Symmetry: D3
Subunit: 273 residues, 6 copies
């Protein structure tokens, strides 16, 4: 049905399309091709007439550490310019995965087994329902420390779901959206309060409680209600996606993120041993 | 206007008080009852001495919603039948609540369900009798979708994730969610049996709260504040009433109501 | 779908052809006929072999508007006009607004009232000759804009033209249609025989669509619709409810009894 | 480059442009020319390319008691012309100045804010509190006026619709609990109100600590992106507010209420 | 209302008529004259017997715009130009934007500047002959669009025409106005006699208004105005505050002095 | 500052930034890197503070014949390949044309097709060499949908019904339609073979038309005028690229090109 991925898996159980991030030893850090795979999986779930809920689950102690920056400072494709290179490597993947999350017609449920960073936290903030394992989860958007700007439609999603002043304080000064902030704004639906050392039991418990909750309901009604609710901010989200993917290009081409990435991995010690 | 045996009204100074007085049937309303509510709002809106519109109820519930016993209970098709019996009532009452120019105040003497909870969410100020009130929108259990402008009003006043969790799984907007979102302006903390004492206390507090103010200023401020989400509400009204028609036509709400 | 003595339909390949077959009464439509039009559009919208919806008529008019003889029990006048006027208008206007197949109107003659309002909602319009026009007699009847014309007429004819035509009860003539590109093709045929006009329009439509990717047409239409969908929905919702204070006041009826 | 106001001063420290309302004996009540001078200072800070944060501080027990009423009650062919010159212009100017600011706006509340100054506080990006005794008061219904300063958009957006209706229709203050329930105050310093100078100094030190390691052009780009969410709503509200307040000003209700 | 020596008004049945009566100074208006125009529109909008507001003029020009001779006390240049330019402009533009009666303009000749903006901001426009035009010399004066023209010019003439005319200081000539339906009727009278033109317009308006229900006209205008009201009163405050930097810079003053 | 391209050049003359498409033998067909280079040139013009007008000219008998298909006809899937090939270049060049702060002027020396026609419809002022220029958007014939922002730009500048008739049936926007809609500011009525003389005459007249004007005034006026439809253009670009992606993936465009 689709190519296999050693980092992301999926299955179909009745009306549920379960996606599982299964790379816990790298904190579920995703490359661009993994975000494209996520987009393709959401399309597959969206074109299935038996699916009603799309559940994104993860593994380990984090949900996802964000984009995989492994090896970005190495000097060693062959694009004609920096603009073309960064266009192909950033703009397309970001716009594609953000649009795939924006237009999903099934109910998107996120199971937080830990913290989320970067574009992964941006996709977490694009889900309809969020469940957390315990009160030690947070969302971090480190754009000001890396020399970049908002990604994944957070321009609309973060002030909509957390408030304008809170969004400004967290983004201008590079602070995390903690669990208290998420609870003062109704971001998390249920906190399961489970030990952080087992995400498999948390995922199984979430699936069981979801199966309990859907008994006797008319599911086409749920899809129609979501179709009506999505029309509140769809235009804002599309406009924000288009503007963000092209505004980040000037920061990528200016060279500041590469300078900061290089000086991050420049911490050799004077006296060895 | 005409007399209705379930809803009454009166005018006291700048207040236009509407009272649902059918507490033994949990204040369940029919389509003509919603049309009568709309007519009463038009009356209140045309009076130049009226500045506030108070909607009060009686009994243990505020209302139990649309009376389905009058739905099950002439037309060339089912589409025409439901265009006449469902679409028109909803467009009329929802627009009458959306475009009201006087300050709408709801006094929750108990739970509200269905379209009545939708009209509660369209009011400007909501007072509750105690901490046991709630709002229920069982659209997913009845085989229907959002109605009464809840598409815009519920995410606006309770949040997006809360609205999704409550609507997709048929869960009530409880009092704790109301306070976490600032829905109730004042909790009177009175016994749920005596609703008329609650209504009288609300009226006396409103009477003593308007002394020394300039009421045309209140109307101008409301006319300015209404312009924020008026287009969203109008579009939602139209699209809501026209999308819920296929659910009635297919027969799922009627099949589910029969048990 | 039930059977109607005044409207019929057929399916020929990608085309879903609706035909108004009441020429002796100028194709005047009652409320149930507008609800039947809405049902026919919903029927054409839900089958995957249909790509174009073509609305044709007969006689010398396209339609003379709403049949008022039918409009001439309930606990109130408001209930009466909410169930008799508001419901059918909001339903048929939404049915025309949200249609996903390409709407084509073949003007065999003048259109009046809500039928001209529906003509203004089609995507492509052909005329039989240069004698057609659209008339919205809202000012002479005691009513206001209907059928999404609030958004449709200023968008397709201009603001000043719309004000001049609507405030003084003047028709949108054919030269005004040409100044604005309202009519895609003028077939220039005698106004007597509308049947040959419909047959020629169908032959040209059959010749034009071969070699094209029809799902591409549907996708382009889906994208183009998002330009003014919100405006049309707001306009429908506010029109159908503001036009109610005029009915309950009694001016349209009192003007029709004369 | 700019003149000197005896009630408002300014200075530039690195990336910070600090504005100081320095008339605590009269509760920092501002006249029309003072609001125009505030707008001019915001334009000056917006044109300086080394400034990234605009810090607006104040003195005494209040942040500002609003427009100077004793200066309002004052050459013109009619009353319409008089109130177009004296009210509409200054309000539209200062509101557009706060709406379109490119640098990060940070308000330091040393006390209650009332009227148009509260409306300007509601237009700031980040607000700090000296203690838990601060509030905002919009007494438009008690003065015979309507919403001004952009509050039509900013109050329901930051405090909710039902709370805004309850507070505006009945002349009640947005208290500190309402602020905490909506996340309006970013930090509460919990210092005694008898010293706003120490509060301002500590805010400046914390802001100096919190900027190390940040790419500031990225902060400006992120604010530029976030501003475009409600910019059209604010622009639409400005005109309608300043032009609908005129029918209230020319009827004489505000003056006869202040003169009694 | 206070009496003005350059603008008068009268009421005839359902018509509120405003006459600019300074033909020897080419009908140049000052800031107090624009505030007086706003007051007159408020007076017309406040009484229940008026349904149409008609703006007329005299001489060879409809109006030459703002009196630059007049504008050629305050602690700053900004505080001067906020009280002189911004307030009058925002007031008169909001007055013309929110008017609920049917605005009709009788163009007896060219209109320049803010007068041309008010002309383009009306609902119906008549012209005395084919020698009328609108000039917006913002680029030649060191200024930008005013009077809500950012919305009204591309809406009523198109984006490309508006760009070509505003970037290079060219007039919106009569053929351009007749390509977009800006003028509803051309009376084709001699430019020497504007009084006969005004009288002919008035008698034709009296003839056209017979047999209609005028509340229907008012309701239809109320509905049609919601199409672009937000864009209009959103661009007003942005225009008046963006022009302030150009006024404070001193370019329009340095340019007018030669 | 910028690389060298053998199909596009540029220069600066006073306040004019002149871009020249100099590949007449291949009908000025552009590849994806050519569109990225065009966007880079627009950014270069937008950063220069001495430039006020951006002039885009071409050569030969066409203005451009659209995207080069020989280049269209390593990646884990077809979705990834088509994302990286098509979506990025389209969103980038469309955003580059939508947000430009200088006055964009296009000199039509002949027909324009496809994405080049979309960019021509995205410019502020268009001049024509003669009455034989046209615009063609063959999306329905290639199995594609609207691109380059045409969803907003075509109905805005040519009308809704005309746009539907021209897009649904793959018909060109001829010079007649452009004249009835005021799309072309001036027709120069020069011979088709005189494209260089056409460019020179356009430059001379633009140079004579700017004398005396205040240029910051023109830039501020454009900044105000551009906010009429900016959000619509951004939304359209964002939805267009992602919707056309699946038409690309299904394989109909490649199939239709190979025959």
């Amino acid at each position: 049905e689709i190519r296999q991925n050693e980092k992301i898996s999926y299955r179909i159980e009745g009306p549920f399309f379960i996606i599982h991030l299964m790379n816990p030893d790298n904190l579920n850090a995703l490359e661009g091709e993994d975000y494209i795979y996520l987009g393709e999986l959401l399309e597959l779930a969206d074109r299935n007439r038996d699916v009603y809920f799309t559940i994104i689950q993860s593994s380990g102690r984090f949900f996802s550490s964000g984009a995989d920056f492994k090896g970005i400072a190495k000097a060693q494709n062959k694009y004609p310019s920096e603009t073309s290179k960064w266009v192909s490597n950033f703009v397309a993947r970001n716009v594609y995965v953000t649009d795939a999350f924006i237009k999903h017609s099934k109910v998107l449920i996120c199971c937080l087994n830990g913290p989320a960073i970067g574009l992964s936290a941006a996709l977490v903030a694009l889900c309809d329902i969020v469940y957390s394992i315990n009160d030690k989860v947070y969302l971090l958007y480190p754009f000001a420390n890396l020399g970049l700007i908002t990604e994944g439609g957070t321009t609309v999603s973060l002030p909509l779901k957390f408030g304008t002043n809170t969004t400004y304080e967290c983004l201008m000064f590079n602070k995390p959206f903690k669990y208290d902030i998420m609870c003062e704004n109704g971001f998390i639906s249920k906190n399961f309060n489970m030990p952080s050392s087992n995400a498999e039991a948390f995922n199984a418990k979430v699936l069981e409680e979801l199966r309990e909750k859907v008994k006797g309901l008319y599911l086409p009604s749920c899809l129609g209600m979501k179709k009506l609710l999505k029309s509140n901010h769809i235009d804002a989200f599309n406009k924000a996606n288009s503007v963000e993917v092209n505004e980040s290009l000037k920061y990528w081409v200016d060279g500041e993120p590469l300078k900061r990435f290089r000086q991050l991995g420049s911490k050799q010690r004077k006296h060895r041993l």
